[PDB]
Amino acid sequence: AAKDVKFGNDARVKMLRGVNVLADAVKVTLGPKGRNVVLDKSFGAPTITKDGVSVAREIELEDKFENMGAQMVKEVASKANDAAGDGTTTATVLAQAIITEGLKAVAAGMNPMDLKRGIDKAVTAAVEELKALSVPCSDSKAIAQVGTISANSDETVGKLIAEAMDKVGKEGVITVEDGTGLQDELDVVEGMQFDRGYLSPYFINKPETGAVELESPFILLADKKISNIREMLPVLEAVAKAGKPLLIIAEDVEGEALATLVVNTMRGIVKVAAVKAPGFGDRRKAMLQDIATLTGGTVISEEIGMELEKATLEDLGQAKRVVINKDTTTIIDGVGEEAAIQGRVAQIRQQIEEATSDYDREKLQERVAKLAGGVAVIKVGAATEVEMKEKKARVEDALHATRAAVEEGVVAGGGVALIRVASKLADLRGQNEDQNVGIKVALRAMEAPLRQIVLNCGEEPSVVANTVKGGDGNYGYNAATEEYGNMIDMGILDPTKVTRSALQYAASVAGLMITTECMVTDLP
Amino acid sequence: AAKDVKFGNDARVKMLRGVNVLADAVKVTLGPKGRNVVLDKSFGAPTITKDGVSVAREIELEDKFENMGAQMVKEVASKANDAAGDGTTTATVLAQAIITEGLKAVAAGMNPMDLKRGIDKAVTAAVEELKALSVPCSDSKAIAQVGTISANSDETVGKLIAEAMDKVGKEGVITVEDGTGLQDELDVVEGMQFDRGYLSPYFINKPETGAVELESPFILLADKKISNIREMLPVLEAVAKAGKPLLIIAEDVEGEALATLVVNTMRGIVKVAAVKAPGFGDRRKAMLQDIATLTGGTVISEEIGMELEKATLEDLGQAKRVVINKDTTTIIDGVGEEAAIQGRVAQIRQQIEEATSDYDREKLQERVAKLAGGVAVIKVGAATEVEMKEKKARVEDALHATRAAVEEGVVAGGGVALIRVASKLADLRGQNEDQNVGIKVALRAMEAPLRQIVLNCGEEPSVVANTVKGGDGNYGYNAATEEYGNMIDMGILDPTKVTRSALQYAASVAGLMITTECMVTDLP
Amino acid sequence: AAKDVKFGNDARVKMLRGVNVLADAVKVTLGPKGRNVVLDKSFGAPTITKDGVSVAREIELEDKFENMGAQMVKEVASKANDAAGDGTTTATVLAQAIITEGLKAVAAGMNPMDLKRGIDKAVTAAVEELKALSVPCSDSKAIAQVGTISANSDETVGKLIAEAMDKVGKEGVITVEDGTGLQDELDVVEGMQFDRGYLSPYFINKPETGAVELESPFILLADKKISNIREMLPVLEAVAKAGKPLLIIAEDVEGEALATLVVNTMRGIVKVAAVKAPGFGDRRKAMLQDIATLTGGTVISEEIGMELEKATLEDLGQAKRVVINKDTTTIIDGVGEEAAIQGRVAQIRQQIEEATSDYDREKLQERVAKLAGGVAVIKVGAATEVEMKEKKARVEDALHATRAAVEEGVVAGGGVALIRVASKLADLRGQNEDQNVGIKVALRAMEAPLRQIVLNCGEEPSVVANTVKGGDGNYGYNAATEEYGNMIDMGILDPTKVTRSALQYAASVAGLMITTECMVTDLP
Amino acid sequence: KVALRAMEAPLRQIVLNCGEEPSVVANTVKGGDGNYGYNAATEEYGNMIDMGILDPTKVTRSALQYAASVAGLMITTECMVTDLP
Numbered sequence A, B, C: 001a002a003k004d005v006k007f008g009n010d011a012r013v014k015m016l017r018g019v020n021v022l023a024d025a026v027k028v029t030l031g032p033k034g035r036n037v038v039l040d041k042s043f044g045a046p047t048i049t050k051d052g053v054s055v056a057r058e059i060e061l062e063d064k065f066e067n068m069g070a071q072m073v074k075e076v077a078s079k080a081n082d083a084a085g086d087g088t089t090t091a092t093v094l095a096q097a098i099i100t101e102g103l104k105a106v107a108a109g110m111n112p113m114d115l116k117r118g119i120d121k122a123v124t125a126a127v128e129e130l131k132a133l134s135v136p137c138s139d140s141k142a143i144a145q146v147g148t149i150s151a152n153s154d155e156t157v158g159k160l161i162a163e164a165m166d167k168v169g170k171e172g173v174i175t176v177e178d179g180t181g182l183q184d185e186l187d188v189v190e191g192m193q194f195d196r197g198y199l200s201p202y203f204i205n206k207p208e209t210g211a212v213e214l215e216s217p218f219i220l221l222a223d224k225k226i227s228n229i230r231e232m233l234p235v236l237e238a239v240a241k242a243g244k245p246l247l248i249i250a251e252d253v254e255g256e257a258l259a260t261l262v263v264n265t266m267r268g269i270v271k272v273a274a275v276k277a278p279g280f281g282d283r284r285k286a287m288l289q290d291i292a293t294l295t296g297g298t299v300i301s302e303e304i305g306m307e308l309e310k311a312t313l314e315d316l317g318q319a320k321r322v323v324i325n326k327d328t329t330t331i332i333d334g335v336g337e338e339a340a341i342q343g344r345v346a347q348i349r350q351q352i353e354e355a356t357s358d359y360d361r362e363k364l365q366e367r368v369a370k371l372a373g374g375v376a377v378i379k380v381g382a383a384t385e386v387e388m389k390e391k392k393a394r395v396e397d398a399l400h401a402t403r404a405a406v407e408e409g410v411v412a413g414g415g416v417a418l419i420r421v422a423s424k425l426a427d428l429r430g431q432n433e434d435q436n437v438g439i440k441v442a443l444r445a446m447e448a449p450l451r452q453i454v455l456n457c458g459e460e461p462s463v464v465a466n467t468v469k470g471g472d473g474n475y476g477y478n479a480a481t482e483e484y485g486n487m488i489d490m491g492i493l494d495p496t497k498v499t500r501s502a503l504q505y506a507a508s509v510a511g512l513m514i515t516t517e518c519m520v521t522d523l524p
Numbered sequence D: 001k002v003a004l005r006a007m008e009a010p011l012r013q014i015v016l017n018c019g020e021e022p023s024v025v026a027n028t029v030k031g032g033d034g035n036y037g038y039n040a041a042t043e044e045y046g047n048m049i050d051m052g053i054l055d056p057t058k059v060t061r062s063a064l065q066y067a068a069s070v071a072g073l074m075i076t077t078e079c080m081v082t083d084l085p
């Protein structure tokens, strides 16, 4: 409908004020001494979090022009989270510093577009510098330090995470779930496992809980539902000749087959249990080949040249044992060759290098870990429920941070890396003076993440920065201990990827944001 | 949508005031002299209760920030109820004292994150102390004392509950129902009983009331409904041959089976009555195996290897006698070996140790009680329906408290245990001064439950506390008798579990709550 | 219903003000130093653009009469975009200049109709001048310069665009898609390709990802779907006999045909893969003739005179090899005579000059490019989503501008061409004085685009223009370098078509707009 | 702590008025000893008395004693009385 128009300074002032509100709320959660922010929920109990991105999503302003400024700055915090899942609070601070200084430059009559180019060039130079500074983080102690630092300096979190990454491996999958107790627990899963129950509660091999343990079983994979069509007897009787247990994978099994099966198992003629496939057509069908190849078995292609009783005992896969409960089925170890195992993994490389990334890579990776790596689950400890989400969320941030630290390395924390790189870039200049100022402005903004940490500690942000700048390399001030030294020695580490991403995302929105002459919005 | 934001002290002050309103309403219901709170309902007659958790649920505030404070403290009261079902009012009081002192520390300029750690560390130390103070609750008199104390010092309640736990047993099930009369009454049921009536009103053995008593009957368990499938006559005949009564359990019996059956029972050929299974198929089928094993019978596996005709007379379970009426069927004692009964119970151990807890365990235990234990029902007397609500509610609290006291033991009441443990922890300090203050803050908050009891009695909370602190061991002040002495001697007992849970839940919410810098809420 | 009516002077003032608001918002985005405009969305995050047409669309006014003026000027910006996709901001400026001066003439008591046609005569004369000044632009450097100038002086954009036009050719199709990285990337597609995957994932010729490469394959085109009328064996057998791979194009291929086909391909009997036709009935059927003629094959006309079985091996088309994946099918090169390729293209000439224009020629040309030319895709780099649309939008404007520059040539930029033509037309007069004033008004308005650019920069618009007028030929002022010289040397180019279109569209609406005596609108 | 911390403010105020960093100047001044300090007029560090910037000991004392006297006096005040508009 009809819209309100603001030009130049009036538009920018409202924009900045909106930006300041969002940024101020986000800043208080930054650092070891960072403070919690509570998001009010109508639906249920209020949520308290130290996560800047979570706070950013919630904030919208009554003033349409101020709101627009806040909405645009909101995205940098949101984008940083997508990139690495950490440093979102830090990224917002850089946007605050850049925008305020950029607008100040704009007031002078300097061309904003030139200022943007200066900032962008400064950013590009800064990114290259970060890569040179990044030190590899391949040791468990360093990994623990990043986890601990991400989790608002919780030593126990870093400790548990380090244990898990070493254990699962480089390509393994680690997740976190709410714990029943007040104590944090770690679970490690060995071999292939999936969320399938047994269709025959009656057949329990030994332990109670519906637990089935088959010793050196034959594994069958099929593409069809089994009901009245019994004809598969020569395959099933072949198993009887062997005197070994049979594991069945198919779309479904109904009582007719199960009825004969339960009696056959009861008298010891055959020890056989049947379970349903993984779940969805493109899902379960895709995961069947790997199960079969891993166990050395053959998938029955209903679709291709195969039939229900057309398939010898040769076709069935072999495993030393399987554990089945009402909710899950696990194979101890299917017997298959590494070349086939690795080969299945090798064909997975296209699957791994997929445009979708989110959703596709994590489930896919799960197969990868199940096929050769492993799966780890972490339980979170806390007395009620509000404590549990906060504790849990930070652990995930640490989980994401460690994954990032391993792949791209780490840099000194406390904002020292950005301030240290700024000194390095003091000689960078552009096409004209407006660009030179823009460059210089970006360098100025680099300092802010460091000083927010100090500010939140109730100490002079400027005084600490002057001494830190005075220092060399990794020298910096530890907010927790309230003293100077070497940041790396202390254990305060920033994954290079989050540091890099924060600066780039903050700068990307900020350059365009400062160049806005006119803003348009609807009246109340 | 659009957000209203408060920072620092303004946020915390609003939060505190909201918490104070919630806690003030809760406090008046704490102690022997505690007073009732009336909750209004547009639906019908208002509910009056001394139960703090119920009062907490109903409190919501007009001020959006104040409401946020109250909503967060609401959870500690509610969480405590989930754990033990008692001490919810006491837990709220601890939250009140911890929060007020914690915020005061925050005002001082101390880092709240550190304050939280001090509190959390202090809580862990306090919990360990409670276990050492805790003494076993085994005798009936002590159980009665906890029941009596829980039910706002009602002696009759403690007396009746003690009789029931001893009588039913350690794993027995106790419930409470309203009473027809003005007097409290206890009902105890032994053997296997269920809420199933008879399909044939016509077959009444001796007492009229739909009452069927069969002497040395054979019990039939089935997985199908019998409409036109009257065939099974050789089974029925085998029973006619036996000359013994027949009890029938199956999904349903139609008039066709009943019609022939009625004539057969009336002229003396056979005495047979049929009743429909427990209710829902997974649930009825699950309870059928125990019924058969308990009576030494065999469940007919229509599903597995059994048919309607196929089943010998010996398959049927045996019992001394059964009692049947329109609403319920009861078996005096099925004849089964002690080992088999115990064995079903043994497989139930997985069932007992279930992640579900709520609902699954209650029903599970009921099966277990029927299998080997006993079931008790308590009726509550009162002239009016609302009086009945208050009286009954307190009885349940005592029931939960006794269950808690038996499993985890008891500690001295009147808040003496928390104040007594506080003296012990005077030696606890940590990483920094802010933590030390946080620890100290928690110790001070410990005192509050004791003083609220005294405050509600119209006496100086501080003066009684000074003498209590002055005392040793279990020495304390009895609010009801208005004098000092040994609390254990008095008969005032606090189950260790409720006391521990209250402190833990109160502190966990309080630690995060005191660390809040910014609050977000919707506009008026 | 019930209309508010304004006459003469009051109506025109309201109209002018509405126009001025719209124009002023548009004006700030004109030039190298032009500034961005942010459009607020209730849906997602706000949009930031320098594109005048996008801004014009979003502007609606609270005052009903002013809004009417704004809506009326909105079309000139919208029409310019439709004609060339560039020059929309400039067109609005001309409308601003013409209308303001025209209204002033109206105020004098001059006949508006005479003023309007005087303007129209001047416009027609100005257009003729533009063709004379227009110079060819067939060289890559000049094309790059227009791309760079359109993209708000971004050199990298102009460089990449020039490369694509040269390589795909005159009739090639170029589109732009968001890039995953922070860098710009160019993709070129050669040969015949369509967006359809394979219905047989099982048959992969060599590389994974479903990549199928058939060497010297036969191509089958059909108007059929195949279920159980597999009966095409004589055709399939003929191919088996030849030992060559088969590619199948038809409405659908399913289960039974694929099942047998899969076994045949795996064991080496035949190497055959099938893919679904292009998409919709007439659309896919229309594209079948070209596929078959290109490959030298014959489409199976179910409808005309051919049967499923009926078709010899010669009917099938031949290609060197094809590339197939899960979402795309590509033919390296079908062997077909150029006379046939051009002949297919020749029948396309009617298709090319189709009244539909929008949509029809774009897709039609895509077929054309696939038939003989090439297809190019450009990817745009940016850290965040808001940067991404702005960067990409400008690239599209440049893409459209280059297309316009090639077909109609270019003129010197900075508004120099309009100012230069205006000096030439100083001798143009009409039937009466009122027309003569209108002519003069048009010439006067021509100057404005030049001065608006300078005004955006921050320099005196009149001073620069006075010196520019003093100059000759292509002499002008470069806003970005802040100096005078030859605009062509500089690399500042305006496609003749956008320049011409802006002037004609602005003038057409402006003439009618200044002739308004009375306005009709609804009440508040 | 309130009294000691309050002492710092006049220095900071001097520097703040000048448009210089109060925290940075205060930090460096704290490091020094005796009459060493920052001269706001000349923007440099040295012996303030030698430089020519000084206050009588009596005025500094009197200002500090009165400020504390009134502050404490307000802190202990529980009631205020005035006429309505």
Ligand SMILES: Nc1ncnc2c1ncn2[C@@H]1O[C@H](COP(=O)(O)OP(=O)(O)O)[C@@H](O)[C@H]1O
Pocket (backbone or CB within 6 Å): A029, A030, A031, A032, A034, A050, A051, A052, A086, A087, A088, A089, A090, A091, A149, A150, A151, A152, A153, A412, A413, A414, A415, A453, A477, A478, A479, A480, A481, A492, A493, A494
């Ligand atoms: N104890 C500490 N001492 C000094 N710096 C710290 C300490 N803990 C964390 N930091 C730093 O401050 C930054 C922000 O903390 P954090 O709240 O985790 O923000 P993110 O949420 O990481 O923006 C870190 O990336 C790190 O460099």
Ligand SMILES: Nc1ncnc2c1ncn2[C@@H]1O[C@H](COP(=O)(O)OP(=O)(O)O)[C@@H](O)[C@H]1O
Pocket (backbone or CB within 6 Å): B029, B030, B031, B032, B034, B050, B051, B052, B086, B087, B088, B089, B090, B091, B149, B150, B151, B152, B153, B412, B413, B414, B415, B453, B477, B478, B479, B480, B481, B492, B493, B494
């Ligand atoms: N007669 C009494 N004398 C002293 N203390 C008592 C007496 N009765 C109860 N108390 C104490 O006060 C607490 C609060 O009573 P209650 O109403 O049951 O609150 P909860 O609802 O248990 O907070 C008890 O747990 C107990 O320690």
Ligand SMILES: Nc1ncnc2c1ncn2[C@@H]1O[C@H](COP(=O)(O)OP(=O)(O)O)[C@@H](O)[C@H]1O
Pocket (backbone or CB within 6 Å): C029, C030, C031, C032, C034, C051, C052, C086, C087, C088, C089, C090, C091, C149, C150, C151, C152, C153, C412, C413, C414, C415, C453, C477, C478, C479, C480, C481, C492, C493, C494
């Ligand atoms: N650096 C420059 N120096 C002088 N003129 C320029 C420069 N850059 C662009 N222009 C001119 O100003 C016009 C407006 O730019 P543009 O934003 O693309 O508007 P349109 O969107 O073209 O109205 C161009 O068509 C061109 O002639």
Ligand SMILES: [Mg+2]
Pocket (backbone or CB within 6 Å): A086, A087, A149, A150, A151, A152, A397
């Ligand atoms: Mg973090």
Ligand SMILES: [Mg+2]
Pocket (backbone or CB within 6 Å): B086, B087, B149, B150, B151, B152, B397, B398
């Ligand atoms: Mg109680």
Ligand SMILES: [Mg+2]
Pocket (backbone or CB within 6 Å): C086, C087, C150, C151, C397
């Ligand atoms: Mg343009």
